[PDB]
Design a protein around this motif. Structure first.
Motif, PDB file in Angstrom:
ATOM      1  N   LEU A  83       0.839  -1.191   0.000  1.00 49.46           N
ATOM      2  CA  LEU A  83       0.000   0.000   0.000  1.00 49.46           C
ATOM      3  C   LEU A  83       0.880   1.250   0.000  1.00 49.46           C
ATOM      4  N   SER A  84       1.864   1.254   0.894  1.00 45.94           N
ATOM      5  CA  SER A  84       2.790   2.373   1.017  1.00 45.94           C
ATOM      6  C   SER A  84       3.552   2.639  -0.281  1.00 45.94           C
ATOM      7  N   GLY A  85       4.100   1.577  -0.867  1.00 49.05           N
ATOM      8  CA  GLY A  85       4.793   1.698  -2.134  1.00 49.05           C
ATOM      9  C   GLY A  85       3.890   2.323  -3.172  1.00 49.05           C
ATOM     10  N   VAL A  86       2.668   1.803  -3.247  1.00 50.27           N
ATOM     11  CA  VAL A  86       1.667   2.307  -4.180  1.00 50.27           C
ATOM     12  C   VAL A  86       1.508   3.805  -3.998  1.00 50.27           C
TER      13      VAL A  86
ATOM     14  N   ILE B  36       8.804   6.826   3.953  1.00 47.54           N
ATOM     15  CA  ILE B  36       9.309   6.750   5.318  1.00 47.54           C
ATOM     16  C   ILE B  36       8.503   5.722   6.099  1.00 47.54           C
ATOM     17  N   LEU B  37       7.182   5.815   5.955  1.00 42.15           N
ATOM     18  CA  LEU B  37       6.268   4.846   6.550  1.00 42.15           C
ATOM     19  C   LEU B  37       6.669   3.440   6.117  1.00 42.15           C
ATOM     20  N   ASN B  38       6.919   3.332   4.818  1.00 44.11           N
ATOM     21  CA  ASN B  38       7.386   2.103   4.205  1.00 44.11           C
ATOM     22  C   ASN B  38       8.603   1.593   4.961  1.00 44.11           C
ATOM     23  N   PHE B  39       9.634   2.427   5.096  1.00 45.25           N
ATOM     24  CA  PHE B  39      10.878   2.012   5.763  1.00 45.25           C
ATOM     25  C   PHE B  39      10.655   1.543   7.199  1.00 45.25           C
ATOM     26  N   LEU B  40       9.689   2.150   7.883  1.00 42.13           N
ATOM     27  CA  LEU B  40       9.316   1.673   9.213  1.00 42.13           C
ATOM     28  C   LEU B  40       8.801   0.238   9.166  1.00 42.13           C
ATOM     29  N   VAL B  41       7.745   0.033   8.381  1.00 39.95           N
ATOM     30  CA  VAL B  41       7.160  -1.300   8.249  1.00 39.95           C
ATOM     31  C   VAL B  41       8.197  -2.340   7.798  1.00 39.95           C
TER      32      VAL B  41
ATOM     33  N   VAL C 211      16.117   1.983   9.568  1.00 35.57           N
ATOM     34  CA  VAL C 211      15.419   3.167  10.051  1.00 35.57           C
ATOM     35  C   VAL C 211      16.365   4.351  10.202  1.00 35.57           C
ATOM     36  N   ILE C 212      17.487   4.140  10.885  1.00 27.29           N
ATOM     37  CA  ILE C 212      18.404   5.237  11.180  1.00 27.29           C
ATOM     38  C   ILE C 212      18.956   5.891   9.920  1.00 27.29           C
ATOM     39  N   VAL C 213      19.551   5.094   9.040  1.00 26.38           N
ATOM     40  CA  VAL C 213      20.177   5.633   7.841  1.00 26.38           C
ATOM     41  C   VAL C 213      19.134   5.907   6.781  1.00 26.38           C
ATOM     42  N   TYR C 214      18.437   4.861   6.346  1.00 29.64           N
ATOM     43  CA  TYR C 214      17.493   5.031   5.255  1.00 29.64           C
ATOM     44  C   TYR C 214      16.391   6.005   5.646  1.00 29.64           C
ATOM     45  N   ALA C 215      15.683   5.725   6.736  1.00 32.86           N
ATOM     46  CA  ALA C 215      14.627   6.638   7.161  1.00 32.86           C
ATOM     47  C   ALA C 215      15.165   7.928   7.801  1.00 32.86           C
TER      48      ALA C 215
END
Lengths: 160, 54, 95, 427, 117
Positions: A14-17, A33-38, A56-60
C-alpha cells in the motif's frame, strides 16, 4: 505469523503504491518513510534486526531527510508542471510495471526454500565478524566508495 | 536495351543502400531525447530479454 | 516466502514510479524503493542461506547512501538556476 | 598489489591537492596511474587473489587496457581543478575492482565506485553536459537497482553472492538475467544503448575517450565472469550490431556516430562471450582500445564540446600523421586486414563459430560490413578539402601518443604471435 | 540475543503513546471558540509578507544532511565492530581503523574546503 504478517505486507505494498502514486512529493517521500518503518519491522520479524535498525536510522533517519531537505529547499512539491504528459504513456508505464512482477513471480513460483537456519536474530553481535571478516574487503571498498562519494558530491556543488 | 537495363540494375542497388540508410534513421528516430522515452524503451528491452531466456 | 514475492512486487512498484514520474527527484525515490525491494529479498534468502545476504544488504544500504548523496548533488546542480525540473525539459540531445 | 598503489594515490592526493598547485596534482595523478600499470607488467604471470578481490590473467589484461585509457585521458585535461584528476583516479580504481572479483555485491560496490565519479566528469557545464550527466545518473542508478536485485536473486537460487555457484532452473535463469541487465548496460549493448548516443555527444570529448575505452574494457572484463546463455547472447548481438550500424548511418556528428558504432562494436565483442576465450577477447579489446583511444584523442584536439563529421575533413593536409592515424583507427574499428582490429574481430568471430552459432555470427558480420560506410566516411574524409574548422595541434604529448597507439595497432595486426602467445597464462 | 517478547511490548508502547497524543489533539480540537476570519488565517506580521517571496534556500542544509548521511553510514558500520572488538583482535581493530581513516580523509577534505558556503 500470517495473522499480522498479512497486515504488514499489505501495509508495505500500500505504502509503495502511495510513493509511486501521489503527485505530492512530500506526501510521497513521507509514504516511503512509513514504508521504511514497516520494512524494518518485517526485517526484524525475519530475524534480521540490526539491519532493521540501521534501515530506520540511515534510510529513514538520514537519507530521506536529506531528500526532504532537497524538496523543501527546491519546492517541487507540485511535481506535475510544464507537462509533456504524453498520456498514452501512463497505461504503457503501468503495463510494463505488471510484467516485471510477472517474470519475477514465475522464477519464484514453484520455488520452495529452507527458510530455517538459526540466525539468532540479525544482531550486529554475530554480524560483526562477517563485516570485518569475509566481508572486510567489501567493507573497505565501500568506505572508499563513500570517500569518493563525498569528494564527488562536494566538487559537484562547489560554485566558484 | 540491355545497357539501360544494367544501368537500372545499378540504380536499384542504390535503392538497397538507401533502404538500409532509412531503416537506420528509423532506428535513429527511435531516440527522441526525452528521458522518459529512454527509460520506457529500456524496461521494454529488458523484458524482451528475460522473455527470450526461457 | 511471502516476503520474496512482496519484494518483487515492490520492485515493480518502483518501476511504475520511475516510468510515471515527471520530476527527477521522484524518479530517484522510486529507484530507492526498488533498491530496498532488493534488500528485503536478500534478507529472506539470508534467513534461508545463512545470514550473508544480510551483510550484503547492509553494504547495499551504504552503496545506496553514497549514490543518494551524489545523485542529489547532481539533481541540485542541474536545476538550481534552472526552473521546474520536469525531466522532459531537456530534449537537446536527439539521435 | 596494484590496488594498494591505487588506493594510496587517491586517498593521498585528496588532501595533498590543498597544498599543491593543480598542475602539481596533475603530475602526481599521472605518475600514480603509470606506476600501477608498471606493477601490472611486473606481475604478468604472477596472478594474485586476496579477498573477493582476485587478480588473474583476465584482470591483468583488462586493467592494463583500462589504465592505459586513464593515462591518455588525463594527458589532455589541463583544467586547474585538482579534482578533475582525482575523480579519474577514483574511477580507475573502481574499474579495476569491477574486473577483479566474482563477488556480486563487491561487484556492485565496485560499480558505484567507477560510475559515480564519471557522472561528475560529465560536466564542462556546457548546457548539454548537464543533460548528459542527468540521463547518465538516472539510467545508471536504475541499472544499479537491477544488478542489485540480481545479486539478491543469485543469492536466491543458490547459497552464494559469488559467481560460479551451481545454479538452479528458472530462478537461476532469472537471476543471471538480472545480473546481465546492469552488466550489459555498462557495455552499451542494445537495446540498452540509448544513453550512449546522448552521453558521448554531451560530455566533453577527452572524458569520452576515458569512458569509451576504460569503461567498455572493465565492463567486458566483469561480463566474462557471468555464465550467460546462447539465446540471449544471440539477441543482444543481433540488436547491437543492427541498430548500432543502421542508426550510425543516420549520424551527422562524429561523437554520436562513434557512439552508435561502439554499440555495434560491443555487439561484435559479445561473440567472444559465446566461448569466453578472453585470450581472444583480451586481444580484441587491446586493438579496440588502442584505436578508439587514438580516435578520441584526435576528437579532443578538434573540440572538447562537439565534433561534426566535416571537421574531421582535410585533417591530412593540416597534420599528416594525425590524418593517417585517424584513418588507421577507422580501419581497425572497421576490422579490416592487416590490422589488429581484424585479429580481435577474427578472434571473437572464431570463438563464435567455434560455439557453433551461425546465423548470429552472419548477421553480426553483414551489418559489420554496413559499418564500412561511416568508417570510410571518416577515414577517407581525412583527405577532402578542409572546410573552416577548429584546430589546436597538440603538445608532443599528444602527437607521440596518437602515433604510438597507431603503431602498436598495426604491429599486432602483423604479429599477434607476439602478444597473443600470452594473453593466456602469461608465458 | 533477547526474546521477541519484549519488542511486542515496544509496539504496545508505541500504541499507548500514539493513543494519548491523539486524545490530546481531540481535547484541543473539540474545546475552543472557533472563528475563522480572513485576518486570523493570514501568516504573520500585520501587512504580512514575513516569508514574502524567496527563490528557495541555502544549500547549507543540504550539505549538513549529506554529510550526516555519510558519517551516519560510517557509524552504522562502526557499531558492529564496537560490540565485538576485543573479540575481533588486532586485525579487526586494524580494519576498522582503515575504514575510519578513509572516511575521516573524506571529512578532512570537505572541511579544508569547508561549508561556510
Amino acid at each position: 505469523m500470517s495473522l499480522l504478517e498479512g497486515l504488514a505486507l499489505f501495509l508495505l505494498l500500500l505504502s509503495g503504491v502511495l510513493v509511486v502514486t501521489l503527485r505530492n512529493a512530500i506526501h510521497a517521500a513521507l509514504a516511503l518513510i512509513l514504508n521504511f518503518l514497516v520494512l524494518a519491522g518485517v526485517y526484524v520479524a525475519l530475524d534480521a534486526r540490526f539491519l532493521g535498525f540501521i534501515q530506520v536510522i540511515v534510510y529513514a533517519g538520514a537519507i530521506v531527510v536529506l531528500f526532504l531537505f532537497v524538496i523543501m529547499l527546491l519546492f517541487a512539491a507540485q511535481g506535475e508542471i510544464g507537462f509533456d504528459p504524453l498520456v498514452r504513456s501512463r497505461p504503457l508505464a503501468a503495463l510494463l510495471a505488471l510484467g516485471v512482477a510477472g517474470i519475477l513471480a514465475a522464477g519464484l513460483w514453484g520455488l520452495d526454500l529452507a527458510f530455517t537456519q538459526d540466525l539468532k536474530g540479525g544482531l550486529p553481535q554475530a554480524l560483526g565478524p562477517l563485516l570485518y571478516g569475509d566481508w572486510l574487503f567489501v567493507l573497505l571498498a565501500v568506505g572508499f566508495l563513500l570517500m569518493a562519494a563525498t569528494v564527488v558530491a562536494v566538487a559537484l556543488v562547489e560554485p566558484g | 536495351a540491355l545497357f539501360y537495363g544494367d544501368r537500372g540494375l545499378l540504380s536499384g542497388y542504390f535503392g538497397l543502400g538507401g533502404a538500409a540508410r532509412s531503416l537506420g534513421q528509423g532506428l535513429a528516430r527511435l531516440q527522441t531525447g526525452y528521458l522518459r522515452v529512454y527509460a520506457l524503451l529500456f524496461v521494454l528491452g529488458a523484458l524482451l530479454l528475460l522473455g527470450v531466456m526461457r | 516466502m511471502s516476503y520474496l514475492l512482496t519484494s518483487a512486487l515492490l520492485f515493480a512498484l518502483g518501476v511504475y514510479g520511475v516510468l510515471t514520474r515527471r520530476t527527477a527527484i521522484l524518479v530517484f525515490l522510486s529507484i530507492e524503493l526498488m533498491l530496498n525491494a532488493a534488500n528485503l529479498s536478500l534478507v529472506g534468502f539470508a534467513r534461508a542461506y545463512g545470514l550473508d545476504g544480510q551483510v550484503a544488504a547492509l553494504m547495499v544500504i551504504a552503496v545506496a547512501a553514497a549514490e543518494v548523496a551524489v545523485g542529489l548533488g547532481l539533481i541540485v546542480a542541474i536545476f538550481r538556476h534552472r526552473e521546474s525540473t520536469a525531466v522532459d525539459d531537456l530534449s537537446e540531445l536527439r539521435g | 598489489m596494484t590496488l594498494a598503489i591505487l588506493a594510496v594515490f587517491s586517498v593521498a592526493l585528496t588532501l595533498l591537492g590543498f597544498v599543491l598547485p593543480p598542475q602539481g596534482v596533475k603530475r602526481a595523478t599521472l605518475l600514480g596511474l603509470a606506476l600501477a600499470l608498471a606493477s601490472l607488467l611486473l606481475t604478468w604471470g604472477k596472478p594474485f587473489a586476496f579477498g573477493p578481490y582476485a587478480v588473474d590473467g583476465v584482470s591483468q589484461v583488462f586493467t592494463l587496457l583500462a589504465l592505459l585509457g586513464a593515462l591518455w585521458t588525463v594527458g589532455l585535461v589541463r583544467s586547474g581543478r585538482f579534482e578533475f584528476y582525482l575523480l579519474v583516479l577514483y574511477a580507475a580504481l573502481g574499474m579495476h575492482l569491477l574486473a577483479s572479483t566474482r563477488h556480486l555485491l563487491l561487484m556492485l560496490v565496485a560499480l558505484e565506485a567507477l560510475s559515480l565519479p564519471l557522472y561528475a566528469l560529465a560536466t564542462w557545464r556546457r548546457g548539454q553536459g548537464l543533460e548528459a550527466a542527468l540521463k547518465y545518473f538516472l539510467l545508471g542508478a536504475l541499472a544499479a537497482a537491477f544488478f542489485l536485485y540480481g545479486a539478491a536473486l543469485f543469492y536466491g537460487a543458490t547459497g552464494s553472492l559469488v559467481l560460479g555457484a551451481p545454479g538452479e532452473g528458472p530462478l537461476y535463469a532469472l537471476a543471471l538475467g538480472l545480473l546481465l541487465v546492469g552488466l550489459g548496460f555498462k557495455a552499451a549493448l542494445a537495446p540498452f544503448h540509448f544513453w550512449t548516443p546522448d552521453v558521448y555527444q554531451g560530455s566533453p570529448t577527452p572524458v569520452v575517450l576515458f569512458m569509451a575505452t576504460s569503461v567498455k574494457a572493465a565492463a567486458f572484463a566483469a561480463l566474462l565472469r557471468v555464465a550467460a546463455p546462447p539465446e540471449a547472447l544471440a539477441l543482444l548481438v543481433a540488436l547491437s550490431v543492427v541498430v548500432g550500424n543502421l542508426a550510425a548511418l543516420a549520424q551527422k556528428e562524429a561523437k554520436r556516430l562513434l557512439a552508435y558504432s561502439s554499440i555495434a562494436h560491443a555487439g561484435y565483442m559479445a561473440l567472444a562471450l559465446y566461448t569466453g576465450n578472453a585470450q581472444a577477447l583480451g586481444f580484441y579489446l587491446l586493438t579496440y582500445v588502442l584505436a578508439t583511444g587514438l580516435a578520441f584523442a584526435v576528437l579532443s584536439q578538434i573540440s572538447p564540446d562537439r565534433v561534426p563529421l566535416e571537421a574531421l575533413r582535410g585533417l591530412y593536409r593540416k597534420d599528416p600523421l594525425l590524418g593517417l592515424a585517424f584513418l588507421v583507427a577507422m580501419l581497425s574499428l572497421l576490422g579490416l586486414p592487416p590490422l589488429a582490429g581484424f585479429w580481435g574481430k577474427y578472434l571473437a568471430f572464431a570463438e563464435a563459430a567455434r560455439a557453433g552459432a551461425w546465423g548470429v555470427l552472419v548477421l553480426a558480420l553483414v551489418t559489420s560490413a554496413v559499418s564500412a560506410y561511416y568508417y570510410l566516411g571518416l577515414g577517407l574524409a581525412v583527405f577532402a578539402r578542409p572546410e573552416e574548422t577548429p584546430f589546436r595541434p597538440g603538445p608532443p604529448w599528444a602527437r607521440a601518443a596518437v602515433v604510438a597507439a597507431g603503431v602498436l595497432l598495426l604491429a599486432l595486426g602483423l604479429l599477434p604471435g607476439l602478444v597473443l602467445p600470452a594473453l593466456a597464462a602469461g608465458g | 540475543m533477547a526474546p521477541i517478547q519484549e519488542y511486542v511490548g515496544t509496539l504496545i508502547y508505541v500504541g499507548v503513546a500514539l493513543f494519548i497524543g491523539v486524545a490530546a489533539l481531540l481535547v484541543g480540537a473539540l474545546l475552543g471558540p472557533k472563528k475563522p476570519g480572513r485576518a486570523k488565517l493570514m501568516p504573520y506580521e500585520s501587512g504580512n509578507d514575513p516569508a514574502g517571496e524567496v527563490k528557495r534556500f541555502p544549500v547549507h542544509f543540504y550539505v549538513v544532511a549529506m554529510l550526516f548521511i555519510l558519517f551516519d553510514v560510517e557509524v552504522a558500520f562502526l557499531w558492529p565492530y564496537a560490540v565485538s572488538a576485543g573479540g575481533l583482535g588486532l586485525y579487526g581493530f586494524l580494519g576498522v581503523l582503515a575504514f575510519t581513516l578513509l572516511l575521516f580523509v573524506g571529512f578532512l577534505y570537505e572541511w579544508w574546503k569547508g561549508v561556510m558556503r
